[PDB]
Design a protein around this motif. Structure first.
Motif, PDB file in Angstrom:
ATOM      1  N   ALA B  75       7.250   6.291   3.503  1.00  9.05           N
ATOM      2  CA  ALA B  75       8.130   7.056   3.819  1.00  9.05           C
ATOM      3  C   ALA B  75       9.045   7.693   2.747  1.00  9.05           C
ATOM      4  CB  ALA B  75       9.041   6.538   4.844  1.00  9.05           C
ATOM      5  N   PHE B  76       9.286   6.481   1.626  1.00  2.00           N
ATOM      6  CA  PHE B  76       9.800   6.692   0.490  1.00  2.00           C
ATOM      7  C   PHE B  76       9.377   7.747  -0.359  1.00  2.00           C
ATOM      8  N   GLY B  77       7.977   7.465  -0.790  1.00  2.00           N
ATOM      9  CA  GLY B  77       6.978   8.282  -1.528  1.00  2.00           C
ATOM     10  C   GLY B  77       6.900   9.623  -1.072  1.00  2.00           C
ATOM     11  N   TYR B  78       6.680   9.930   0.227  1.00  2.00           N
ATOM     12  CA  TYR B  78       6.662  11.331   0.720  1.00  2.00           C
ATOM     13  C   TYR B  78       7.842  12.114   0.446  1.00  2.00           C
ATOM     14  N   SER B  79       9.010  11.641   0.327  1.00  2.00           N
ATOM     15  CA  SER B  79      10.074  12.311  -0.064  1.00  2.00           C
ATOM     16  C   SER B  79      10.193  12.194  -1.456  1.00  2.00           C
ATOM     17  CB  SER B  79      11.566  11.755   0.524  1.00  2.00           C
ATOM     18  N   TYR B  82       8.137  15.269  -2.317  1.00  2.00           N
ATOM     19  CA  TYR B  82       8.464  16.370  -1.825  1.00  2.00           C
ATOM     20  C   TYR B  82       9.732  16.759  -3.098  1.00  2.00           C
ATOM     21  N   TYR B  83      10.598  15.928  -3.396  1.00  2.00           N
ATOM     22  CA  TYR B  83      11.422  16.232  -4.322  1.00  2.00           C
ATOM     23  C   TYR B  83      10.816  16.274  -5.944  1.00  2.00           C
TER      24      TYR B  83
END
Lengths: 57, 85
Positions: B75-79, B82-83
């Motif tokens: 969940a952290f790495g997908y964002s 994205y950033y």
């Protein structure tokens, strides 16, 4: 009633599992038994401590 | 020689010096022991502790207890991508 006198020591030897190893108590028991044996020997073998002066003289 | 006290010499030494040491260790061990599993202290919950006492607890210890970390990091790495990307 000399049975009871050694009865306690015989019972102790029956329960001397903690008292086994008596170096100088069996010697004392031997002394006590030797005293009784000599006493019975003096009583039996030796005649009366007296004189048969009634007829022997 | 004459009369003595062969048994009464238990004063100078108690029976079983090695058994005495073992029993002395036994007294301290058994006495300083919980009555029946006393002093558990399992529950805990404070921000992260609500996860520690629940997810790192050995009631399950299955594979999902570690996999929660993988799901969260994903969940952290997908964002992060994205950033970043």
């Amino acid at each position: 009633a000399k049975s009871a006198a050694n009865k306690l020591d015989w019972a102790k030897v029956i329960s001397s599992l903690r008292i086994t190893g008596s170096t100088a108590t069996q010697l004392s028991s031997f002394k006590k038994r030797n005293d009784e044996a000599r006493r019975q020997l003096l009583e039996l073998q030796s005649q009366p401590t007296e004189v048969d002066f009634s007829h022997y003289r | 020689v004459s009369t003595l006290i062969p048994p009464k010499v238990v004063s100078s030494k108690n029976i079983g010096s090695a058994p005495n040491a073992k029993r002395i260790a036994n007294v301290v061990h058994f006495y300083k022991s919980l009555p029946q599993g006393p002093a558990p202290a399992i529950k805990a919950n404070t921000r992260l502790a609500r996860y520690k006492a629940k997810y790192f607890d050995g009631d399950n210890a299955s594979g999902k207890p570690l996999w929660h970390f993988a799901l969260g990091i994903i969940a952290f790495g997908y964002s992060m991508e994205y950033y970043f990307h």
